[PDB]
Amino acid sequence: AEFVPPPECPVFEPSWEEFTDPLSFIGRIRPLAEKTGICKIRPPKDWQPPFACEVKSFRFTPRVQRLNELEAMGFEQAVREYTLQSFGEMADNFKSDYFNMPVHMVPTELVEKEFWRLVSSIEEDVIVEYGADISSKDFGSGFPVKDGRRKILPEEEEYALSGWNLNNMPVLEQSVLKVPWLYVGMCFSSFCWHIEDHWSYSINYLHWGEPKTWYGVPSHAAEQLEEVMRELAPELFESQPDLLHQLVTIMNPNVLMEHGVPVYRTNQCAGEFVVTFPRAYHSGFNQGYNFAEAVNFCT
């Protein structure tokens, strides 16, 4: 049976007045978005920050991902070093060869349907690479920053100072007595179901490239998801602590939905934000070559 797409999560298109600061805006949409776990935010059309990464020196060794590693229960090691350009050439070549069509012509529903088929397939072993958890301290943030390590044009200063610049999000949690991370995706590269440390918010910006497909669960269903996950996880992993079990928490959203867990989806396109709410489980995969930046923040 083919994959059944979950219902779409909320998308907000704030006016320039509503777009003044993200913390106030997120607070206002909370009564709705908290009930879906994730939401998408489309900035005004004229809000277009420039890409400020040091592309000439951008080099990384992505992690290798075998889509059916869990159902299939011979080592592929992270030895291939890429540049942004060489990874993109590999990524586009992989996708165009896999689907036998230009990368921009593959429907998002088809990649989604094929991703979940491959995750459970025992006869077909598809292996991809993900440039995940690249620190913005290594080659700079995708957003312009007033660091002095790179030049900022006068038309770019407003983005260096914008509250929607992920480098300007509040990250200090209140108690008695962090930098954004970068993600260089390719088709089928993915992240498993998880929540954030300290049940923190997270905000995610797709700088460019093909969409990032998300799945989200509202926080009121967090314990229901955890029960389903442990009931259906392999018995060898069933008793592992949450922080370790999250390393293998691959699960088809339809399986969660069949067990009563509400799940929402979205395709995050270039230039759009995705916000995850406290204790909102989320997962996803990339439709193709793209570049994302993310940070956890607190209210």
Ligand X SMILES: *CC(=O)Nc1cccc([C@@H](OCCN2CCCCC2)c2cc3nccc(C(=O)O)c3s2)c1
Using left for φ > 0, alpha for ψ between -120 and 50, and beta otherwise, residue 115 falls in alpha
Least separation, in Å, of the C-beta of 7 and ligand X? 20
95 membership: H or E segment, kind and range: helix 84-99
Q: Which two tokens stand for residue 120?
A: 């459970």
Among 135, 112, 255, which residue's Cα sits nearest to residue 193? 255
Among residues 166 and 292, whose Cβ is nearest to ligand X?
Answer: 292
CA distances from 97 to 85, 131, 147 (A): 18, 21, 41
Cα torsion 262, 265, 273, 137: sign: positive
Residue 267, CB-side half-sphere exposure with 13 Å CA sphere = 13
User: Would you say 53 and 208 are in contact if contact means Cβ atoms under 8 Å apart?
Assistant: no
Query: Taking CB under 6 A as the rule, does residue 229 contact ligand X?
Result: no
Stretch that binds ligand X, among 20-28, 75-83, 234-242, 247-255 (CB under 6 A): 247-255
Query: Taking CB under 6 A as the rule, does residue 116 contact ligand X?
Result: no
Query: Taking CB under 6 A as the rule, does residue 127 contact ligand X?
Result: no
Least separation, in Å, of the C-beta of 87 and ligand X? 15
Interface with ligand X (CB under 6 A), residue from 12, 60, 164, 191 = 191
Q: Angle at Cα 268 formed by Cα 3 and Cα 242, nearest 5°?
A: 70
Query: Taking CB under 6 A as the rule, does residue 33 contact ligand X?
Result: no
Name the residue whose CB lies closest to ligand X: 192
Known binder of ligand: residue 159?
no
Among residues 128 and 292, whose Cβ is nearest to ligand X?
Answer: 292
Least separation, in Å, of the C-beta of 163 and ligand X? 21
Interface with ligand X (CB under 6 A)? 130, 132-133, 181, 183, 191-192, 204, 212, 247-250, 292, 294
Query: Where is the binding site, in residues?
Result: 130, 194, 196, 202, 204, 212, 282
Query: Where is the binding site for Fe cation, in residues?
Result: 194, 196, 282
